[model samples]
Target: AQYEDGKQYTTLEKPVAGAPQVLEFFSFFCPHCYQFEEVLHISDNVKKKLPEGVKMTKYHVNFMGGDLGKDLTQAWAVAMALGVEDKVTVPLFEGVQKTQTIRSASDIRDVFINAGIKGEEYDAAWNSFVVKSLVAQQEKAAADVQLRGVPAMFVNGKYQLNPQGMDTSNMDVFVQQYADTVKYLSEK
Candidate 1:
């Protein structure tokens, strides 16, 4: 990818340290984020496109602070804790966007079970202390980042990719620009 620094993105006030962290602040119920998954081909391509040593993480934002939002957030945390995010991430989004079937934890568990996760394993991870703590941490992290909305991307915790600012009609260009921007920020 070619680097054209000023054309695509901006810098953060205080850059984070260590390996590049590409953190996506999103919620499963957010329609914009749901579209982003398809537009960017995020589940299938974003991870593969990242430069070596760059790590990507998705944080379920509780912007709604409602029961549905909170439930989905916990479900996401549980999935991540169980190391099954890759398996259930897109499905969770689709459940909300397409079927409106994932309204509670039980629904999310069904998603996992249908994906081939054993019932015992799902119960264990879903009720684990680690999942609880991580859910709390995810809330704090979203707050710490001062997240304003869903579908926001923070590269190395230094630069924020404003999804709202992108031209979604031309998604191919937008995807490449996002990838290039991340690559440039990671190297810096």
Candidate 2:
């Protein structure tokens, strides 16, 4: 399929460098994003299909108000900072969406503890300057994309693989389309 502007994807005014940056904008509380989380999982078959030089990152969206959104956003920043996102990313989603376990900063910290992260280590990473900077960058990226919803994918900070009006019942197809689109754009 050809890259149809505003149909399959939309281009950014300024394309961010480091081609094949697969950035996923998501929120822990979003049911749709929760369903889409499988695509973000490292163990997922689709992930293994990604070509080299492609770096996938998740940016927790803060659009969902209340304490839940704010706390998860910070918690995710901490996880990314400590380089334990591969360990806690899926658990974080399951904790919030299924078990309804995580509700605050303390709750988030406990989840990390259960994942074998020491209390002091968790505290240090959670409050580190690096995490704060990452949070700020996430906020800016969300704003720059003019994000309207969760589970949005931006390829190389340019093409947004939007599924807004598309039929998404067949998630496998959506995943493949995303991969193909990224590969197509990466080769450009």
Task: Give each model's clash number.
Answer: 0, 0
* 16-47 per-residue lDDT for model 1 (tens digits): 55413888778887887887785566534556
| lDDT at 116, model 2 | 94
Model 2, runs deviating above 4 Å:
13-20, 39-46, 165-169
Top model number, lDDT: 2
Every model's TM-score: 0.86, 0.86
Model 2 lDDT per residue over 1-188, tens place: 46677776778886766533777788889887777764534224335666776667789988784787888898899888888987897788888888988877787888899999999998988788998998998898887777778777787777877555344567666666666665665555
Q: Which ten residues in a row have the lowest lDDT in candidate 2?
A: 38-47
RMSD of each: 2.7, 2.6
